[PDB]
Design an enzyme around this catalytic site. Sequence first.
Site, PDB file in Angstrom:
ATOM      1  N   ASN A 287       0.846  -1.223   0.000  1.00  0.00           N
ATOM      2  CA  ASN A 287       0.000   0.000   0.000  1.00  0.00           C
ATOM      3  C   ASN A 287       0.873   1.262   0.000  1.00  0.00           C
ATOM      4  OD1 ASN A 287      -2.589   1.499   0.271  1.00  0.00           O
ATOM      5  ND2 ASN A 287      -1.606   2.159   2.181  1.00  0.00           N
ATOM      6  N   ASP A 433      -0.478  -6.451   5.115  1.00  0.00           N
ATOM      7  CA  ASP A 433      -0.952  -5.203   5.768  1.00  0.00           C
ATOM      8  C   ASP A 433      -1.893  -4.454   4.815  1.00  0.00           C
ATOM      9  OD1 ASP A 433      -0.444  -3.535   8.287  1.00  0.00           O
ATOM     10  OD2 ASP A 433      -0.152  -2.027   6.708  1.00  0.00           O
ATOM     11  N   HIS A 437      -6.716  -1.268   1.132  1.00  0.00           N
ATOM     12  CA  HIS A 437      -6.180   0.007   0.578  1.00  0.00           C
ATOM     13  C   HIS A 437      -5.411  -0.242  -0.726  1.00  0.00           C
ATOM     14  CE1 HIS A 437      -7.654   2.234   3.994  1.00  0.00           C
ATOM     15  NE2 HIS A 437      -7.215   1.231   4.758  1.00  0.00           N
ATOM     16  N   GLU A 476      -4.786  -8.334   6.578  1.00  0.00           N
ATOM     17  CA  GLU A 476      -5.575  -7.465   7.488  1.00  0.00           C
ATOM     18  C   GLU A 476      -6.411  -6.513   6.632  1.00  0.00           C
ATOM     19  OE1 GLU A 476      -4.707  -5.294  11.697  1.00  0.00           O
ATOM     20  OE2 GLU A 476      -4.174  -4.122   9.909  1.00  0.00           O
TER      21      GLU A 476
END
Length: 650
Positions: A287, A433, A437, A476
Site C-alpha cells: 500500500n 498489511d 487500501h 488485514e
Amino acid sequence: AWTTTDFPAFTEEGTGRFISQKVVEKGTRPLQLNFDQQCWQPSGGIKLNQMLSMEPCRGTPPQWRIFRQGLYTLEVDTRSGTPTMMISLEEKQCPKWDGKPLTIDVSKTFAEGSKVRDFYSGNVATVSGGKITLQPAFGSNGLLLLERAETAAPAPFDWHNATVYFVLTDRFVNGNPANDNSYGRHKDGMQEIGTFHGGDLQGLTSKLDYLQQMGVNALWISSPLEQIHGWVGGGTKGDFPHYAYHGYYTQDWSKLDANMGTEADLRRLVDEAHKRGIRILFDVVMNHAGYATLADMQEFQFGSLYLQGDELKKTLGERWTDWKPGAGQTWHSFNDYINFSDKAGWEKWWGKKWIRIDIGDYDNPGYDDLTMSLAFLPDLKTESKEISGLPNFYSHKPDTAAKAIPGYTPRDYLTHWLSQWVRDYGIDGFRVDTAKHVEMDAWQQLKTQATAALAEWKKANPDKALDAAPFWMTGEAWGHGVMQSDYYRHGFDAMINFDYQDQAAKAATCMANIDLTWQQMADKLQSFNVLSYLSSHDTRLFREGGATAAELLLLAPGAVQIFYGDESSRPFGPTGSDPLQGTRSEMNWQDVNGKAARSVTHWQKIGQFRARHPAIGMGKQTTLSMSRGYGFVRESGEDKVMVIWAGQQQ
Ligand SMILES: C[C@H]1O[C@H](O[C@H]2[C@H](O)[C@@H](O)[C@@H](O[C@H]3[C@H](O)[C@@H](O)[C@@H](O)O[C@@H]3CO)O[C@@H]2CO)[C@H](O)[C@@H](O)[C@@H]1N[C@H]1C=C(CO)[C@@H](O)[C@H](O)[C@H]1O
Ligand SMILES: C[C@H]1O[C@H](O[C@H]2[C@H](O)[C@@H](O)[C@@H](O[C@H]3[C@H](O)[C@@H](O)[C@H](O)O[C@@H]3CO)O[C@@H]2CO)[C@H](O)[C@@H](O)[C@@H]1N[C@H]1C=C(CO)[C@@H](O)[C@H](O)[C@H]1O
Ligand SMILES: C[C@H]1O[C@H](O[C@H]2[C@H](O)[C@@H](O)[C@@H](O[C@H]3[C@H](O)[C@@H](O)[C@H](O)O[C@@H]3CO)O[C@@H]2CO)[C@H](O)[C@@H](O)[C@@H]1N[C@H]1C=C(CO)[C@@H](O)[C@H](O)[C@H]1O
Ligand SMILES: C[C@H]1O[C@H](O[C@H]2[C@H](O)[C@@H](O)[C@@H](O)O[C@@H]2CO)[C@H](O)[C@@H](O)[C@@H]1N[C@H]1C=C(CO)[C@@H](O)[C@H](O)[C@H]1O
Ligand SMILES: [Ca+2]
Ligand SMILES: [Ca+2]
C-alpha cells in the site's frame, strides 16, 4: 511429594516445578514446605508474584499474611538445585465446580474399554459403562483435554489448525547489540516508545525451541526489509520520536534492514524454524512506503527545507536526524523546517510515477480507501499501468538490489521484490498489511508470483522443503469478520478475524460463555479458514482473561494468532499520545523465567493439545449437555476430542 498445611499434595506443572492450589481466607499462618525428611521455609520477606529464596527450617516458621480471600497457587522450583517458591492470587450464571473429580459420559465419543488420556494432567482412564472419572489438575483451570491414549505426537500441519506466533522482532530478543543503531538511529533516553529497542533475527532464532514447545507451527515476523532510516513525530503530541521499529515504513523492499541482521541471519532463522516444523510468514506492505525523514532526505539527497546553507547546520546539525526538540517544541516541530510545497526538491524522492501524497508535484491522494494517503503515508500507485523505472532517489542509494526492468510498473517491481525473498529463502507465506487500501488484482499478482517463487525454492531445496504445500497468504482488511469475502477469490487463503477479540472478552470471567461463538465458527469454517486473535499491535493486549487466555484462543476453530507475550501476560508498556504504542512493549523474559513460568507451561500444554488434534481447528462441534460443568466434542476425519470445563472454583 512437596506438602504444606491446608494445601493438597503438590503436583508437577512443567519439569522441576510443583504447584498446589487452595482457596485461603484472610489472616496470617506459618509457611514451611516439607519434601521427604527435608523442611524448607522462605529466608527473605514473603510477597506475592516474586521468587522467594528458602532456607532449611530453623526456629519459628515465617508468617505468611493473607491480605485478600481467593484461590492461591503455591509453586516450588527445584531446577536451580535449592528450592525457591512463588505465591500468586486469583480473585473473585456460570457453571460452578466443587473442586472434586468429574464423572464424564464419553459413551458417544470413546469406545467401551478404551484408554482415554487427559492430556493436561497425563492421567489415563479406561471407559467403563460409557464413563470415566478424572480430577482436573492444578493449573488446568478445571479443564480436561480428553484424547485417545494412543495419541503420541503432533498431527500433520494444517493452516486450518495453525498456531501462528506474531512477533515484533525489534521488541522480542536482542541477539546482537552492535546493530541496534543502524543508519545513525538513536535511543530517545525517555520511555523508548517509538525507538528500535534492538531485537533482531538472531535473537528470535534463539527462541525457536521455546516457540516449538508452545505448539507454534507458524512464525509471523514484522517485515525485516529495509525501513526509512530516520524518525517522525510520535502520536498527536510529538512526545516521542517514532522510528520504523515495527517494519511497516519500508524504503527498500530489495534489502534487509541492518537492525534485523544479515542474509545469513534470515537463512538460519528460516532453516532452523523449518527443522522444528515451524512455517515462516513475512508481514508485507504494498500500500505505502515510509514517511519522509530528515535521515533519508540528507542521505539520499531529496526534499526541500526552509533552512539553507549553514543556518541549516545551526538548526538541524551536521546529521539532520540528530535534531532534538528545544524548549516549546515537540518531535513534530521539525516539519516547520521542511518545505513540502516545493515541486522540484520532492520529485527527487519516489517520483510522480510511484506515489500519491499531498507534497509538491505528486498526484493528489483520492478520497477512497484504494487511492487515499492513509495516515499521510506515500500511497504506492499499485493500479498504475505506466512504466515507472526505479524510484528517483534510488539513484543515490548504491547498496540497493533493485534494478530497472523493461516494461515494469510500480506493482510489477513490488510483487517481484517481495517474491524474491520467497524464491531465495523458502518463505511459506505472507501476512498482508492494509489489504483494503490496494486493489484486489494487485494481491492476486503477488499471490501468483509468490506461489511460483516457493514452488521454485522447494524444487531447488528438496532436503529443506517440509512438504509440497502451496504458498499461503493472510491479510488485514480492517474490521473483517468470519465471512468468505471476495479477498478469498483474489489470492487470500484466510483473512484476519477482528470479531473474536470481543467474543473472548465476554467469556473472560466464564469460559462457557464462548460456546455459541465456537459453535458458529466450527460450522462456518467447514468451508473456509480465518486467523483469530486475542491481542494485536493495532487493537489492545488481552489481559482480562486471568489465567484462561490460553484456552480462550487455542481452542477456537480456524487458525489462531498468539501475539508475543500473550503466554507471559506481557504488560501494556509506555504509550504516550499514541494509544496503540503500549501493545508493542518489550517481551517480559524476566517474568517468563519467574512469575509467568506456570502461565508459559499452561500455554505449552493447551498449544501441544491443539497441535495433536486438527479436530480443534477444523472439527464439527457438538456441545454436550451435563448437570455439572461445560463440555464439547469436535471431530475432523479420524480425529475426535472432548474438552470438559469443570467450571468456576470460587
Ligand atoms: C547499517 C550501517 O549503518 C552505519 O552506516 C550508515 C550510516 O549511518 C549512514 O549515515 C550512511 O552513511 C553513508 C553516507 O550517507 C554517504 O554519504 C557516505 O558518506 O558514506 C556513508 C557510509 O556508508 O550509510 C551507512 C551505510 O548504510 C554503520 O556505520 C555501518 O556499519 C552499518 N553497516 C552494516 C550493514 C551491513 C550490510 O549487511 C554490513 O555489511 C556492515 O558490516 C554493517 O556494519
Ligand atoms: C477512517 C478509516 O478507518 C479504517 O482505516 C483503518 C485501516 O484500514 C487500517 O489499515 C489501519 O491503518 C493503519 C495501517 O494499517 C498501518 O500500516 C499504518 O502505519 O497506520 C494506519 C493507522 O491509520 O487502521 C485504520 C483505522 O485507524 C477503515 O478501514 C477505513 O476505510 C476508514 N476510511 C474512511 C475514510 C474515507 C475518506 O473520506 C473513505 O474513503 C472511506 O470509505 C472510509 O471508510
Ligand atoms: C531469565 C533471564 O531473563 C532475561 O534474559 C533474557 C534476555 O533478555 C534475552 O535477550 C535472551 O538472551 C539470551 C539469548 O536468547 C541467547 O541466544 C544467548 O545465548 O543468551 C542470552 C542471555 O541469556 O534470553 C534471556 C533469557 O530468556 C534477563 O535479561 C536475565 O537477567 C535473566 N537471567 C536470570 C537467569 C538465571 C539462570 O537461571 C537466574 O539464575 C538469574 O538470577 C537471572 O539473572
Ligand atoms: C537541502 C540541500 O541539500 C543538499 O545540499 C548540500 C550540498 O550538496 C553540499 O555540498 C553542502 O553545500 O551542503 C548542502 C546542504 O547540506 C543538496 O545538494 C541540495 O540539492 C538540497 N536542496 C534542496 C532544497 C530545495 C529548496 O529548499 C530545492 O531547491 C532542491 O532541489 C533540494 O534538493
Ligand atoms: Ca540488535
Ligand atoms: Ca493505496
